[model samples]
Target chain A: ESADLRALAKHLYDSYIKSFPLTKAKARAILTGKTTDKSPFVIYDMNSLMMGEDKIKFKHITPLQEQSKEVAIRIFQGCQFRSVEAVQEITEYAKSIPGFVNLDLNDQVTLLKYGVHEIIYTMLASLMNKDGVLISEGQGFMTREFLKSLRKPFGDFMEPKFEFAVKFNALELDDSDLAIFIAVIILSGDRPGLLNVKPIEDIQDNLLQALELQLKLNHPESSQLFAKLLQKMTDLRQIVTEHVQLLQVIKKTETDMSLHPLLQEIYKDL
Target chain B: ESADLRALAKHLYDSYIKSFPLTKAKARAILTGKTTDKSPFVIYDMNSLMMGEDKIKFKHITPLQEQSKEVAIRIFQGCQFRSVEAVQEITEYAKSIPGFVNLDLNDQVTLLKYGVHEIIYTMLASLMNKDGVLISEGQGFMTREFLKSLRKPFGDFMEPKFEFAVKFNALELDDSDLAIFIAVIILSGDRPGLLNVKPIEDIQDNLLQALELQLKLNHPESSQLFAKLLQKMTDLRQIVTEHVQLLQVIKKTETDMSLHPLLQEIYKDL
Candidate 1:
């Protein structure tokens, strides 16, 4: 039963990856359970989310170019044991792979969004034995995708800084939780960098401070509690950053990687 | 401030009624609280009635004649305080009004449905504190009218029966808490002519029992608490049934009643 379930998960992942050229291989590996990749979880409460009898509306966030970069950083940070200091490090990592940076921004977003979306769906499917979760994983994925495609206006914002803020936003930490103790290494440049722009920096600072304020407000008497959860998430980020380096190295070496062998066998059909 | 508010309310009400065939005198009397029609108190919460979001996929009864009758009953009972028996009584009373009985069943349904829908909509408007609710009420009324106009497939099994059971389906007891009371009524109608069917007696009985069983399983301790709520709804049906007599009389007078002198003056331009 587990094998069959795993195979189904892989098939779904592969199908989604095949839809985009960028993250096809990564999605495939995650699907087959043959890799150390841990999927990002999306939260949804079926019954609690219901607005009225048999009707529900969900809040959706589309993975735009900036959001896609954030997701990549998240996944990359997942595999490594530490966080990167700059966007240049991420871009350099991507450039090591011949086909990685070839895909357009839209396709890249589709690849990451659909990949994480599918894996989470598959895991949720396995929990179908539990009550009040009648929606199929496919339905959940499609609903989110449909909402994402509706072109919800998030207003004008640039990619780099917006991406970094999203990463901080995703960290589920409370004020009383353990603090993340990673060294703060700012990317240095001669003049004010792109991240220093008013709109982007303002949004980023507001989001981060808002999150910290929320946590502090929740636990007025305890600072140590906030420190703990922050450390746990930071530890996770540390592990992802390591594998990201390995993936970058592997891409640099796989220059001649091709599906020629499979193509040769299927030439008769073509 | 109170005088200004009352003046504004009166002006709005008088203006609305003036657009209809109502006389200025009659409309003014209603607005100034000189008349105590109590019509404004009549209300049906579509949200509470499952006439809400769930109405997107509605089922229609069959057999053109019977279907017509069913629609007629719905139009009548759709009013806040009306029932199937009231419809029968009113039509019988209409026999005394010379040309009233001459109107075909379809015509009767059309007139009642449109009139009642409009009046109920207007009454609901009186309850709203803002213009948004007033606009929404108009739109919602139009939507209900559009849905009511759908054609039902013709078949004996789908034929509308004048019997109380056919008119009072699950949609009648819209509140979730009051759902089982409807099942109880269906069970109570079990004896041969009691519910107008023999074969469905056990089915109805089983449904009520099933609801009872479910209440025990889900809320063993709170079964009596919820049952009391259901009982209140059922008890409300009796009070509503009594008011149906007043409705029957109004419906009977609708066709022959002369336009009021003030009403004639208001519509002189049109």
Candidate 2:
């Protein structure tokens, strides 16, 4: 029953990986702020900005200044927005899976809440080179050193993720493998509060089987690749846990710095 | 719907914790080989033991000599048996969960396969009192120092677990809380290859909700206890991943030393 499903997963993975080519020079250019095209890294356009007491909106434009509280918070907010956008795309991808949307709505929320960061991190790992992740859509590269230099909680927040990404990159999983892996992560029945676990479990099981089969075909000589990938999921879990801890610390210490509503919701009861 | 379930979970946790009490002096006595009654630490009785070409049975006496291949393997084997015994007990406890047995047989196996070690480590944390875990039924205490002194693979295997256990002990969770926590761990719907995830997820949700309520009732001042406990699960996952990696290394390098069949199976695809 799952054989065709497995093949489809493999096909999806193949297509997804093919879409994103790793441009090392482009990533380097973005990180060094040498990019002529600034559309990708720009989070807010200050010229046409809409400022409000409760909320503010800005157009996409490249940042002109170096790291400061304003720049750091903006960068962090940009990353959070990117994560949300990625989560939306991932949600669509998950819903496209047969029977996924048919599951209880509460179950769907539970999965998305827990699984989104994992999927986001997996995607971020794809954008990462040896240096660090290409943030602001490859228009800017956030080096590990620069990340470490960011003030208190923001710096602490990013360091562990980059560390995980570096180790994850070491595994060298391709796009197809990651797609299947992300599917497995999203469809996981283990999320804290679930309504209908069986269907999700079934989907996850099929995806996992598909992933194993795909890895076998993709990396025939690497017997341990599949196992290593599974281990990476556990590693990702640890990184997210650290991220949550840092969030809690920020909540306690940085009372003045308002967290994004979306992130605040995600960090709730984590 | 879940209130009664939470109360029942609390009752079960309370009962489980009451069964074991840590005695530091006894543990010290056993580790120093000064105990007059040496029943807990014994692995095999030479008299009733059957010797095979592949397997050699050891008598239930302390080794006079220092660390050697035989002693190291025996220590490893003893720890392995202790883990199996612990798993068996935990399985029984899991079955006692209201809906756990109602889960599909395959789901039952899947949960046990992934969760047993996690539960074991959690329980082992209870036996720890500042120094180390009480091995051989509180007959011997394996200090962190002594464990580090052991050779590669074996030493590597024990260190991460002890490290986690020490940190876990810092949470200061009582027996009842741990019982509920272990229930949550066992009934986790997130285990890969589950046949019916909904039932498992239902059980876990009820368990988690119960844990939160119990934490509130027990530690009213501590708003973050439940969240901290939940984070420990992620911490546990990381420690287990490292343990699995060490096991893989051991399996690859220590060919002559036999792994217990059950332990061998648990490490599969981990």
Candidate 3:
């Protein structure tokens, strides 16, 4: 029945909604551009969170090098911590997909390894605007410039995420749309070392069918909506590849930089 | 009044809809993907016009040199001939724009010279689709591949137009939406050699206000629609500059090329 795709998207959103990091209140504010106004950060002339109207904490930066490293490490740790949970979310989401759970174990492993980073970064867009990401769960507003000023490799990584987020946000996808989008990205058929490509392609098609139907209902007037999402998938793939290289280089350079053991193994190929 | 911009767009469409080259019946078919079928040209396995469903004329190409020249010249003349008429349409359209005609004559001329090309190409998107352009109004399906096979300068020129058209068509603009969009493009303040930018900037803003309102009314679900059109404006500007260089180079190479006297003056700048 026509209702199958609708039911499929409904289940994806209903079941996995808890896994997403954004709050409904905050995500709505970000989506409609209410967040564009200067928070308390207005007076500081950089970016900071507004606890209340006319309240601001303009933080320190005396040691540019240390500040950069401190900020970069915090964000990187924040990124790593979430991605650890992200794998569980993606794994569960994939299991719920019709053909995905029954796939060869090795194929499942290959997809999870490649898909984890894409899923995490794409979701972070919920916290990002054109200016910068709302880090610390939407409390602190870190400007893209601040992210750009960080020390080597770390400096290089944040720009691409903002660039991707800025474009991705323009598509105006809601939670339900993104739920199916994540599923599509997770089950991307082109991931290396796939033992059974044919089965997963069918699975990807089922996920895509649900995604198209959801977009039609959610964004009836948007003619380019589907094409733009597919374009963004290519962009996310590029970012994931660049991110892995950045990870490898930083692992060597920032010798003491911490990673969650889960992510450490994930990135270190151990 | 809110109605001023609405009246403005309605008048622009009602008055100048005829000035646009595309027919309502045919343009609707192209926009909706109904024209994607191969028609009688399916039998030929190449791009050609189908006057009727099963009627096909697979024309001559035995003399590669002559056939290439004939095809190239025919398309070149078609492009040149229409651009001749395009100027008059643009001038009339500009006169109706709220603040356009009363500007200094040089500013008027500068805008027309630059604006004419952008308007023509953008409007042609009404008659184009993802695969190829419907060259002879709506009947002739000239595939980009066939256009690509033509020699040197001709091959280069056709691709960019198709590329621009393919992306532009994705915006799904009806004639009314396009009417305001063209007004915005014509009054773009940054065009070279503008004697007065300040007054025209105000005009551009009024045009933009109308455009934003029209999009809200016409395509409320498409959150990215306005931003994407602005992006396409930048793309059209790039194409216009490149087209001049192509025209200049081809003029040097194809000495016998027939340019309409009106277009000859418009392009040759003598």
The candidate maximizing DockQ is 2
**DockQ score for model 3, please?**
0.03
Clashes of each: 32, 7, 0
Q: What is the C-alpha lDDT of each candidate?
A: 0.29, 0.64, 0.68
Report the interface RMSD that candidate 1 achieves against the true structure, in angstroms: 26.3
lDDT of 1 by residue, B36-146 (tens): 653222113333223342332222222233324443434332332322222333333223322323445444444343223222222232322211111122222222233
Candidate 3 TM-score, C-alpha based: 0.47
- Which residue segments of model 1 deviate by more than 4 Å? A1-270, B1-181, B190-198, B220-223, B226-230, B257-270
**Candidate 1 chain A, which ten residues in sequence have the lowest lDDT sum?**
A182-191
Tens digits of per-residue lDDT, candidate 2, A214-238, equal 7878888764355456646666876
Which model, 1 or 3, shows the larger lDDT?
Answer: 3
Error of 2 at A104 (Å): 45
My TM-score estimates for the predictions, one after another, are 0.18, 0.48, 0.47
For model 3, fnat equals 0.00
lDDT of 3 by residue, B1-270 (tens): 669978877877776666666654456665465576633132122333222233423332323335465656655666676677668877877888877879999999888877888888887777666666664455456667767777777889868888878767766788788888888888876666899987997787677768878998999887546645764665675577678778888878888876567665555341
In terms of TM-score, the best-performing candidate is 2
Best by lDDT: 3
CAPRI rating of model 1: incorrect
The best-first sequence of candidates by TM-score reads: 2, 3, 1
DockQ measured for candidate 1: 0.00
State the lDDT of candidate 1 residue by residue for A1-270, as single tens digits: 334433433333333333322232333333343564553222232222232112322222223324343322322222122111122222333232223334444443333322221122222222222111222221221222222222222111112122322333233332111111110001101011232333332322322333334445555654322222232332232233343344345345545322233222212210
Per-model RMSD to reference: 28.4, 19.1, 12.0
